[PDB]
Structure formats: structure tokens, C-alpha cells
Amino acid sequence: TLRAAVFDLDGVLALPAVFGVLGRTEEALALPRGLLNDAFQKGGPEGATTRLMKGEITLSQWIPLMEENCRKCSETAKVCLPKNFSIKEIFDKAISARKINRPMLQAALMLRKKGFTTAILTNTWLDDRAERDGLAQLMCELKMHFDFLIESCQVGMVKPEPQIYKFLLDTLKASPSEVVFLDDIGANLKPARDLGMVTILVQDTDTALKELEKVTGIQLLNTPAPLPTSCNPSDMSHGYVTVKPRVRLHFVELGSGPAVCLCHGFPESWYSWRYQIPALAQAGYRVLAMDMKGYGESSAPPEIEEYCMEVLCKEMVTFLDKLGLSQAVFIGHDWGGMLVWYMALFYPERVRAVASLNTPFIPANPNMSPLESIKANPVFDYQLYFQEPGVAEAELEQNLSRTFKSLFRASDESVLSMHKVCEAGGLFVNSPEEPSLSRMVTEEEIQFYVQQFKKSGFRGPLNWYRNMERNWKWACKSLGRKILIPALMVTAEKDFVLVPQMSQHMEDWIPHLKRGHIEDCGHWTQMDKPTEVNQILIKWLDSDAR
Amino acid sequence: TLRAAVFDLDGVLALPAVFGVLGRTEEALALPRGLLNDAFQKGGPEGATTRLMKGEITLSQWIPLMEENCRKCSETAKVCLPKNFSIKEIFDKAISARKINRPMLQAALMLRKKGFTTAILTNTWLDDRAERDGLAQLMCELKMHFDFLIESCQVGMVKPEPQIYKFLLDTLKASPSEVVFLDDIGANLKPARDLGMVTILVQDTDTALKELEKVTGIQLLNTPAPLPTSCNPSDMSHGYVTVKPRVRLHFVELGSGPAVCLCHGFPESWYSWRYQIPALAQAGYRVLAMDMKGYGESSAPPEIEEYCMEVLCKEMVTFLDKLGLSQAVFIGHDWGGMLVWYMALFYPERVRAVASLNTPFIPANPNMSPLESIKANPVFDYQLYFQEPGVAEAELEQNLSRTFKSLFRASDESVLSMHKVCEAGGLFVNSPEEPSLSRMVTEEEIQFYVQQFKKSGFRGPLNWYRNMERNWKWACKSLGRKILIPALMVTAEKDFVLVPQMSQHMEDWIPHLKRGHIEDCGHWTQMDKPTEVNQILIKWLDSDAR
Ligand SMILES: c1ccc(CCc2n[nH]c3ccccc23)cc1
Ligand SMILES: c1ccc(CCc2n[nH]c3ccccc23)cc1
Ligand SMILES: c1ccc(CCc2n[nH]c3ccccc23)cc1
Ligand SMILES: c1ccc(CCc2n[nH]c3ccccc23)cc1
């Protein structure tokens, strides 16, 4: 019974096979068939290529040896390599052209999700070329999805040598009959077969996956669209910045490039962005996913005034100062969406671009008290219930698992009604004691929120709603301003509190505003529709944030 | 008696005064004298400029209002503004041209070092221009060196209004007679003088500093070259990455740009790079200053084998994987210098560039045991003393303050002799009980190392020296290789163990190697000669690491 799946890289997890470029080059330059492939494998186990694959020499050291073999091969064939014949040039193009074979990665991902140990076993080199970063990026993206990465140049062994297969079985801690091995080179399959491993010769991905599905008894072909990569909290880089004597801000950090600061809503976590963090880092950005003040590993002072927008924004500026960042793109959701529009209004020089999910920008009404305004909208009733210190804390802290299970539901999953919350005397009065688990979340993901909220509870988080008069007076200072930096407004069709129509007048204050819209999406945008959020954010980041 | 110094920005901390560009523009376009300055100040307290400076409107909103004032002014003057007259163009150039007035910053720095409260008080705007980042960077660089930054657009008040001066005195928590106020605009000095503050009209910096020196009784002019900016540990962003179940790596992070990974030596800290971190971040790099395995907030497992180079390098690769970095430039010193050359040899695709301070690259001798080789050099005697587990730990852990005070000394400060350490029976046998404080370090900086080493002591650090046979066998695998990625070797004239001559044969293994050399520099390169280390590293980073 199979419990391990091993994949080759070239011609299996990455396409087109860098190998096959040699045949393409021979044809393009009208060279004798097999000339390049023969020069490449010259001397077999004794040759330059075996030394390269074993890690004895680097790729740059190998380039002139491959050139000498090409000359030897051409002279025997009574032919002439052209004027401009360059191995480096051919090699550079071949690697640049090679991309991840997405359906093969998806199958490996599905097997690992079903309890399989997965590994990449590859004949590779020590790349010291000036353009080595492209391959480094490819390897980084691929390797994260596997339990093991076994590279010939690192282990000093090579396929088809029997030692590498014995090494592979030892790292897997599996007997050969428990292993599926996929390779595009028949000679490399032979020792695995000879040991009793299930082997698949990979020509076209589809046939290989049909064989793989048949042998594992797991559907890999024609499977529903997979969710984006998520985050494992213990595998993240955790950052901590003191913004003032009693306040420290926690964040999760991934990727390189322009800084993208993610600001969650109420009652959330940096983890609310779990499906966005790997995707945005992969798209070429440095992601900084915050635990906002009052949440998770960030400080939670008790005072209401510590949570007004002026102080929250000032602390976010200090956060950038201390990290040495002159700017960041600010992406917010719910309360974070509100903070993010105010960062753009009060500190435009520190905000590269601004994006909000669900939260529209509506300016302060100087002719009405915020209480009058909030009362003038039945869906904002829950905010009046959040006003009296202690009441909502007691209800939200009674049973954490029930709290998150009741809150975190898709638009069609008996989502809490925000109308008549005060009258009913609570958010969960008509909610079950043991709510069912929503399709959006696993039991483990609920437990992460439970563990996070065990530290400070709901006082700090609820205090974000307890500064209406303070925020109104501060916001009134910005009434003559306009948001003229790049801006994105993402609406969610089925958010019944932060309704798409609430964002209708935004163009009056943000004339150059760009928009996104998610159909069949509730309040929990990031986990409800992760694939579409990623697509909207990446597209807007690449076009307007750089 | 003075205890506070307030500085204006334009024409005081930053030059040329963005104001003075208006006069330069009038002259260049042969416009009537004062035309641009008159349009700029149009309507005085009622005008567009006062609204801009108070934060009512943003810079982009102000641009068309300034244009309308310029038209009004030109029509009254019976003149014609040219075809291509653009306020944005003039304004963009003016800000780009404006730089920090370094001697004025130096004086502010010296006053703060002598116990003064320092502040920047400025009439500024909310910058939402597409090129706002340049100014954001300038403000970030400047603001860090001051206790307070008071911006007109943030406080809704403006100079010369008396309210801003009362606000300034309140934030300073000082009576007017305790304050020096420096400004280039006479009208803005008037309310400060009228309140009893010492005022300086800034025309040329030199005269202003002569007045400032005379009034404070502190030498500010003709002062010796100041040391680079250092780090305050509690003001840094602290990062934590788990590389494997029992191992977590700590790092300090500052700046944006290409990642630069700093690797300290023995027995050190991330803090050994305190003078490099602000400088490299300021030069356009993302600095990652490590606590290497066994040190500070990084894990310190007891096992010797956890500290061999193969495992240390593998963990540094995992560190990059978990942060989502495909590459970093690796800069090492002492043991970190050794790790860094091995990162280049075994993982060139992950190393953008490699630099070493003092530590040369000398390949393994396959025809000699590492013990034979180490014994063949009298200065490496101390390494044999470090071999027996517990002996060096006991001596180095007996009195931490004595340990760091004895170790951390300049070449002319009775630096410990590394010859006959075994014979003498210890490093400190001929060293005083209470060593004097070296010129390189303060008492507080010694105490930071003391506090750091209180957690794990010297076992983990000493284990870096206890893998000679393991490192030799691993290094022998790389004997056919060459380092062909960008590389820098920095030698120190007076390091009597890692002598410059030890690096003489490096070009045979690193043909494209670049060099740096520091005269009158001992083993503690970074703190001995910080200004020159920064200059060598920045120059090499900008030319070879990008
Ligand atoms: C998520 C839900 C609501 C809010 C802002 C609350 C609000 N909604 N409408 C208002 C009118 C005046 C003052 C405050 C408000 C932020 C994030
Ligand atoms: C607090 C109570 C209920 C919910 C789910 C219902 C909801 N849907 N849309 C919202 C916008 C702001 C506040 C609440 C909601 C989130 C946070
Ligand atoms: C700082 C001082 C010494 C070393 C390496 C030790 C060494 N110095 N010379 C050697 C010869 C063979 C094996 C190891 C060594 C690294 C960092
Ligand atoms: C351990 C003992 C002494 C010193 C100062 C003397 C010294 N100078 N140069 C060195 C190179 C490697 C190891 C030691 C030294 C540093 C670390």
C-alpha cells in the first residue's frame, strides 16, 4: 500500500524539460541530430556532466567543458558549429522558459493532503550564473509543497546510480513497495522498479496522472479548483516592533519586494490573510500581515482612547519608522479597511497605495453626531450593543469556539442578523450552543482564533467601536481633502452590513478610484473567496503599486 | 539655562531652501522679481498656501490654486507666463534637489548627546504627489535623530501664529528661556523671541552654528568626525524564524531593498553590526542582522554537531525559505565570515553576493588533518584550548563583564595574546580582574553583551570551534569548485590572528574577487573602524550586489 510519492523535476514538476531544449536547438541551427545531447552526456559517468550533477564543479565551471565537448562532437561529425554558438545563451534561455507544471504540482499537493509523504528527487547543478535567481525562485516555490527535496549536487550521488534510490528510501523511512516514483527518463525509473517501487514514465502529464490516480486510488484528474496556499503559523517569520512604552505590534512577514501592509477587521487576526500571504509574496511583494492593536501577540491596553483612529494611525506610522520603511501599500478589511482610508487621508506620503475590502470610504458628516448617523441605519444596531463596556466582552468571551463558529460563516450558512441586536440582548441569543462548522473554516483554524483570543479577549478589539465622537472630530479635519494616491475598493455582493451600495459616492472623494467586485461573497471576504481576492489584489498591485 | 533646541526644516535642516527655488525660477524664466513668491503667499492667512500648511487640502489639490494665483499676479504685472509654465515640474525638481544640511544635523545630534531635548518645527504639507516617496525618505532619515517632529499640516496650526509656539513649549515641557529656536525666516523667529526664547536667524550654517555654540556653551563647529548612527535594541524590529523543531533564529530587521544578511563572529551578537545597520538601511538595503545559532535570542542546543558548518548553512537556507527570500547578500565577520564563504560554495543560487571581514577563504587541505593544520600556526593555539568541553565555558562565564571588557579592545589597548593560551591555562590568566573600558565601547554596550550571554552562555558559541574534522570532510567535497559569484574580502591591518597575508592566495579560488583594506584596525572591525567598514560595504553593495 502506497504512502509516498516521489517526483522528478525536469520534465515532471517543471516544463518544458530543459533537456528537450537541446533537440530544439539542433533543429533551429540545422545541426546534426543528437549532436548537442551527445556532447552533453560525453564520457557518461566520467564526463563533465556527471561531475556537475554530483556537485564537484559549478555550472559556470561546466560551461567551457560543454563547449569543448561540442567542438569534439562536431569535428567527428564533419560539421561546423556557427559563428555565434554560445552554450551560456542557450542554457540561460532554456531555464528562463522552464515553468512549474501546475497540474503535476496540484496532484502532489492532493497526495500530501491525503497523508502521503512527498519528495522531489532531481539531478541538478550548483548554479553560480549571474541569472541564477530565476531558478532559485522556482525551487523555492516548488520545495515548500514537499516533505523532502533531494538534489544530486548536494548528496554527491546521481540518478541512475543505485545509491541515490537507497538514500531516497532512507529519507522517506519507507519500504520500496510503499513508493510511487515519477520520472521522464526511462533509465532513471529502472533502479526504482528493480527495487520494487511503483514507477510511472512521464511523457504527457495527463496520462501520467491517470496512472498515478489508478495506482493511489485518489482522484487527481478533473478535481475541483483547489484553494490558494495557506499559512502554518509555526513556519512563519514573526516580527515584533515596540511603537511606544506600553505598545508592541506583532506581524507575520513573507516575501521580497515593495512592502504590503495587511490590516484585519473585527474580531480577527493576521491569520485572516492566510490565503493572501503566500500568493502576494509569490507575486513579488514583501507582505507584512499585522495583528492589529488589541489582538493576538500585539499589545492590548485597556483604555478606550488607545483605540481611536488618530492613535492607531500614528502607531502605524511609527511601525514604518522603526522598520525603516518610507512607504507601504495599505490593504484593509472591515475595521482595518477604515484605518487604511484614514492612513491615505492623513499620511499620503507613507502610503504607496490604498486598498479596502468591503469597507467603503464615507466622510464624517459635520452636521450630525456619529451616534445620530449610526442610529439612522438598522444594520449598524450591533455597534450600539458594543458601546457599554463589559456587555459584549462577557458574551463574546463566554465560549470562544462558539463565538468564532457563529461569526465565521458564508452568506448561505445562517449568518448572524445584525438588526435588533440590542432588543434581543446579544449577538448569539438566537444562535445554537454548538454551531456547525462553516465550509470556509476547519476545526484547527477555529482553534487558532480561540488560542489567540485567550490572551487579551475582546476589550481591546471592542474599543475600536468605542471612539465614534473622537474619530468624528478627527475625520472632520480632513473634509477639504481628496484621496489622490492609487486606490482600490473591493465590494462583496452578500455582505449585508458593508453593502456594495454604501460605496456608491466614493468617486467624489477619490476620483481616480479603481474597483473590484466579488459575487456570492459575504463579510469574511479573504476566506470566503480567496482565489478571487488574490486575483483582484495581484492585478491592482502589479498595475498601480508596482 | 538652555536644555532644548528647535530647528526649522527648510533652509535649516534641509538645503537648498525649497522656498529659494521660486527666486531661482523667476531669474531663469526672466519673470518679474517676486512674481512667484507673491503668487505663493497670495491672500496670506486666507490663501491656498495657509490651507495647504494647515492640512485642509493636500499638495495635489494646491497645485491648480498656485497656478491660478500665478496667472492673477502675471496679469496685474502686465506680463506673460511662458507656454510650458508648470508648477508641478518646478515643485518636483525643488524637492528632489533638497538634501539634509549635514553639519546642522551633526550639531542637533551633539546637543541631544549632551542631554538636550531636540525638535523639528516645520510649516509643511500633506504630500500626495506620485513622487512623494523622496520627501518621505528625507523626513524618515531626519526625524529619527530628534525627540519631536511638529508639522503644521498635522497640528492644523502654522508659523508665525502664536498658538504653534505655545504648542511647541507644551510638547517640550520647557519654559521659553530654556529653548533655542533656529529658523531662516525672520517673521517666524519673532513670536519665539517675543515669548523669551533664544532665537537664531539662519542664513549661512557656519554663522548660525557659531551663534548656537556660543549660546549653549557646547562645541558644535570644528568637532572631530562623529561615529555612524548606532542601534537602540528596544527601538528595532525583532524577527523570529523556527528553522527546525528545537531551533529558532533571531534577527534585527531594518530598511527596504535587496536583503543583506549580517553574520557575526565569536563571541558576539547581532549588536556587533550596530554601526552598520542604520547605514546599510539608509543606503537602500533590507538589513537582516542575525543572532547566530548559540547566541542571544536564537536557540542554543547543547550538542557539538548542531554547530558544524553543514548544519549551520542548511539552517541559513531554511531561514531564507521561511522568510520567502530566494537570495540574500551574505556579509560575515570572524566565524560568520567562514560560514559566508561556505554559503557561496554550497548554495551559490541563494547568495546574491558574499563579503567577509578579516576571515579569508582557505580551502581544506585533503592531505592533512585539521588538527595538524591548526597546530602548524602559533596564533591558532587558543582553538586547542577551546576543544575540551567545559574548560573555556567556565573561564568565559566566570565574570561576563570581565570577559567582554578583556576581549573587546582596539589593537593598541593591550589586546589579548592568542599564543601559548593552553600553556598559560586560559585566555585571561595574565589579564586584570577589572579591565579598563576600551575606547570602542561604552559601559552600557558591554552590559548588553553581558545580558545576552546570561541566557545560554558559551557552550553553543564554543561548539562552532568543536567541528574541525566534520567541517574538513564537508569542505573537501567543494575542492574542485570556484567562487564565481560577486565577492568581497576586507582585511584589517592589525588583526594579529586573522592577518591580511592569510588572504594572499584567495584569487586562485575566487578569480573576480574585490578587496578592501582597513589600516590601524584590530579584530573587532565593525566597532573599531565603523565609518570605513560602512564606506567599503556600501560602495561594494552599490557596484556588485545592486
Ligand atoms: C466596520 C464596520 C463599521 C465601521 C465604522 C462605523 C460607522 N458606520 N457608519 C458610521 C457613521 C459615523 C461614525 C462611525 C460609523 C468600521 C468598520
Ligand atoms: C461582529 C459581529 C458579526 C459579524 C458577521 C456579520 C457581519 N456581516 N457584515 C458585517 C460588517 C461589520 C460587522 C459585522 C458584520 C462580524 C463581526
Ligand atoms: C575565526 C577563526 C578561525 C576559523 C577557522 C579555524 C581554522 N583556522 N585554520 C584552520 C585549518 C583547518 C581547519 C580549521 C581552521 C574561523 C573563524
Ligand atoms: C576569542 C578570544 C580572543 C579574541 C581577541 C583576539 C583576536 N584577535 N583576532 C582573532 C581571531 C580569532 C579569534 C580571536 C582573535 C576574540 C575571540
User: Is the C-alpha dihedral spanning A440, A446, A448, A454 positive or negative?
Assistant: positive
CB A530 within 8 Å of CB A226:
no
Cβ-based contacts of A478 with chain B (< 8 Å): 55
CB A357 within 8 Å of CB A272:
no
Ligand 3 geometric centre to CA of B341 (Å): 12
Dihedral angle computed from the Cα positions of residues B295, B296, B297 and B298, in that order, rounded to the nearest 10 degrees: -10
**Ligand 4 mutation target, pool B380, B402, B405, B416, most atoms within 8 A of CB:** B416
Query: Relative to the alpha carbon of A370, which ligand is closest?
Result: 1
Q: How many residues does chain B have?
A: 546
Using CA coordinates, name the residue in chain A closest to B242: A235
Q: All 3 cell numbers of residue B532? A: 570605513
**Cα A122 versus chain centre, distance:** 25
- Show the CA angle centred on residue B449, arms to residues B446 and B451, nearest 5°: 110
Cβ-based contacts of A349 with chain B (< 8 Å): 126-128, 132-133, 135-136, 139
Residue A151: how many other CB atoms lie within 10 Å: 19
Q: All 3 cell numbers of residue B485? A: 559569484
- Contacts with A534 (C-beta within 8 Å, 6 or more apart), sequence order: A228, A275, A276, A279, A280
Whole-Å CA distances, B381 to A536, B363, B369, B372, B417: 63, 20, 16, 12, 10
CB B347 within 8 Å of CB B325:
no
Three-state SS sequence of B386-451: CCCCCHHHHHHHCCHHHHHHHHCCCCCCCCCCCCCHHHHCCCCCCCCCCCCCCCCCCHHHHHHHHH
Is residue A468 lining ligand 1, measured as CB closer than 6 Å? Answer: yes
Q: How far is A253 from chain B (nearest CA, A)?
A: 7
| Beta strands at A487-492 and A351-357: parallel, antiparallel or unpaired | parallel
Q: All 3 cell numbers of residue B195? A: 515669548
Q: How far apart are CA A242 and CA A315, in angstroms?
A: 9
Active site residue A523: yes
Burial of A517 (0-12, 13-18, 19+ CB in 10 A): middle
**Ligand 2 mutation target, pool A268, A416, A419, A449, most atoms within 8 A of CB:** A416
Q: Which helix (H) or strand (E) holds A531?
A: helix A530-540
CB B152 within 8 Å of CB B55:
yes
Using CA coordinates, name the residue in chain B closest to A139: B326
Is residue A148 lining ligand 1, measured as CB closer than 6 Å? Answer: no
**Ligand 4 mutation target, pool B374, B380, B413, B523, most atoms within 8 A of CB:** B523
Active site residue B271: no
Name residue B514's beta-bridge partners.
B488
Q: How far apart are CA B191 and CA B193, in angstroms?
A: 5
> Which of A262, A264, A263, A268 shows the shortest CA–CA distance to A287?
A262
CB B354 within 8 Å of CB B344:
yes
Cβ-based contacts of A325 with chain B (< 8 Å): 255-256
Rg (CA), chain B: 29
Nearest-CA residue for ligand 2 atom 12 is: A497
CB A295 within 8 Å of CB A269:
yes
Active site residue B307: no
Most distant pair of Cα atoms in chain A: their distance: 95
Q: How far apart are CA B94 and CA B66, in angstroms?
A: 15
Q: How far apart are CA B143 and CA B120, in angstroms?
A: 8
> Which of B351, B321, B334, B359 shows the shortest CA–CA distance to B261?
B351
Active site residue: B334, B381, B528, B544, which one? B334
What backbone phi and psi angles, to 5 degrees, belong to A116? -80, 150
Q: Do residue B322 and residue A235 have CB atoms under 8 angstroms apart? A: yes
Three-state SS sequence of A486-499: CEEEEEECCCCCCC
Q: How far apart are CA A499 and CA A254, in angstroms?
A: 32
CB A469 within 8 Å of CB A476:
no
CB A39 within 8 Å of CB A85:
no
The residue whose grid cell reads 516580527 is A239
Q: How far apart are CA B1 and CA A282, in angstroms?
A: 58
Cis? peptide before A160, omega within 30° of 0: yes
Residue A431: how many other CB atoms lie within 10 Å: 16
CB B296 within 8 Å of CB B259:
no
Q: What is the DSSP letter of B526?
A: H
CB A487 within 8 Å of CB A355:
yes
Cis? peptide before B160, omega within 30° of 0: yes
Q: Do residue A350 and residue B136 have CB atoms under 8 angstroms apart? A: yes
Q: Do residue B281 and residue A321 have CB atoms under 8 angstroms apart? A: no
**Complete DSSP assignment for B170-213:** HHHT--GGGEEEEES-HHHHHHHHHTT-EEEE-SSHHHHHHHHH
CB B313 within 8 Å of CB B246:
no
Across A281-296, b (16+ Cβ under 10 Å) vs e yields bbbebbbbbbbbbbbb
- Contacts with A437 (C-beta within 8 Å, 6 or more apart), sequence order: A405, A443, A446
A200: three-class secondary structure by DSSP: strand
Residue A37: how many other CB atoms lie within 10 Å: 16
Active site residue: B38, B465, B495, B544, which one? B465
Is residue A462 lining ligand 2, measured as CB closer than 6 Å? Answer: no
Active site residue: A334, A381, A495, A544, which one? A334
Q: What is the DSSP letter of A117?
A: E
CB B29 within 8 Å of CB B82:
yes
CB A73 within 8 Å of CB A38:
yes
Query: Relative to the alpha carbon of B523, which ligand is closest?
Result: 4
Q: Is B10 within any annotated ligand binding site?
A: yes
Q: How far apart are CA A209 and CA B342, in angstroms?
A: 40
Q: Which CATH superfamily is domain A1-16+97-217 in?
A: HAD superfamily/HAD-like (3.40.50.1000)
Q: Half-sphere exposure of residue B16, counting CA atoms within 13 Å on the CB side? A: 10
Q: How far apart are CA B110 and CA A210, in angstroms?
A: 74
Q: All 3 cell numbers of residue A242? A: 515596540
Q: How far apart are CA B423 and CA B410, in angstroms?
A: 25
| Beta strands at A237-244 and A247-254: parallel, antiparallel or unpaired | antiparallel
Three-state SS sequence of B276-341: CHHHHHHCCCEEEEECCCCCCCCCCCCCHHHHCHHHHHHHHHHHHHHHCCCCEEEEEECHHHHHHH
Interface test with B, best of A62, A128, A477, A508 (most B CBs within 10 A): A128
Cβ-based contacts of B281 with chain A (< 8 Å): 324
Is residue A499 lining ligand 2, measured as CB closer than 6 Å? Answer: no
Nearest-CA residue for ligand 4 atom 11 is: B497
Q: How far apart are CA B15 and CA A354, in angstroms?
A: 32
Ligand 4 geometric centre to CA of B415 (Å): 9
- Contacts with A510 (C-beta within 8 Å, 6 or more apart), sequence order: A361, A482, A483, A484, A487, A489
B257: three-class secondary structure by DSSP: coil
> Which of A493, A510, A519 shows the shortest CA–CA distance to A544?
A510
**Complete DSSP assignment for A208-266:** HHHHHHHHHT---SSPPPPPPP---GGGSEEEEEEEETTEEEEEEEE-SSSEEEEE--T
Q: How many residues does chain A have?
A: 546
Rg (CA), chain A: 29
CB B91 within 8 Å of CB B98:
no
- Show the CA angle centred on residue A195, arms to residues A191 and A198, nearest 5°: 90
Is residue B409 lining ligand 4, measured as CB closer than 6 Å? Answer: no
Nearest-CA residue for ligand 2 atom 4 is: A407
- Contacts with A52 (C-beta within 8 Å, 6 or more apart), sequence order: A58, A59, A62, A125, A126, A153
Cβ-based contacts of A132 with chain B (< 8 Å): 348-349, 485
| Beta strands at B487-492 and B117-122: parallel, antiparallel or unpaired | unpaired
CB B544 within 8 Å of CB B514:
yes
Q: What is the resolution of this structure in A?
A: 2.2
> Which of B96, B92, B95, B49 shows the shortest CA–CA distance to B68?
B49
> Which of A193, A212, A192, A217 shows the shortest CA–CA distance to A202?
A212
Using CA coordinates, name the residue in chain A closest to B476: A56
Whole-Å CA distances, B499 to A335, B420, B491, B504: 59, 18, 8, 10
Q: How far apart are CA A272 and CA A289, in angstroms?
A: 9
Query: Relative to the alpha carbon of A336, which ligand is closest?
Result: 1
CATH 3.40.50.1820 in chain A, residue ranges: 236-546
Q: What is the DSSP letter of B34?
A: T
Ligand 3 geometric centre to CA of B373 (Å): 9
Q: How far apart are CA B81 and CA B85, in angstroms?
A: 6
- Show the CA angle centred on residue B42, arms to residues B40 and B44, nearest 5°: 110
B17-96 carries CATH number 3.30.230.10 = no
Q: Half-sphere exposure of residue B193, counting CA atoms within 13 Å on the CB side? A: 12
Q: How far is B171 from chain A (nearest CA, A)?
A: 16
Q: How far apart are CA B316 and CA B298, in angstroms?
A: 12
CB B449 within 8 Å of CB B269:
yes
Q: How far apart are CA B345 and CA A126, in angstroms?
A: 9
E strand segments, A51-154: 99-100, 117-122, 148-151
Experiment used for this model? X-ray
Most distant pair of Cα atoms in chain B: their distance: 94
What backbone phi and psi angles, to 5 degrees, belong to B224? -60, 155
Cis? peptide before B16, omega within 30° of 0: yes
Q: What is the DSSP letter of A542?
A: I
What's the CATH code, domain B236-546? Answer: 3.40.50.1820
Is residue B407 lining ligand 4, measured as CB closer than 6 Å? Answer: yes
Q: How far apart are CA B281 and CA A55, in angstroms?
A: 35
Q: How far apart are CA A122 and CA B120, in angstroms?
A: 59
Single-letter amino acid, residue A384: L
CB B169 within 8 Å of CB B179:
yes
> Which of B225, B206, B10, B5 shows the shortest CA–CA distance to B100?
B10
CB A233 within 8 Å of CB A241:
no
What backbone phi and psi angles, to 5 degrees, belong to A183? -150, 155
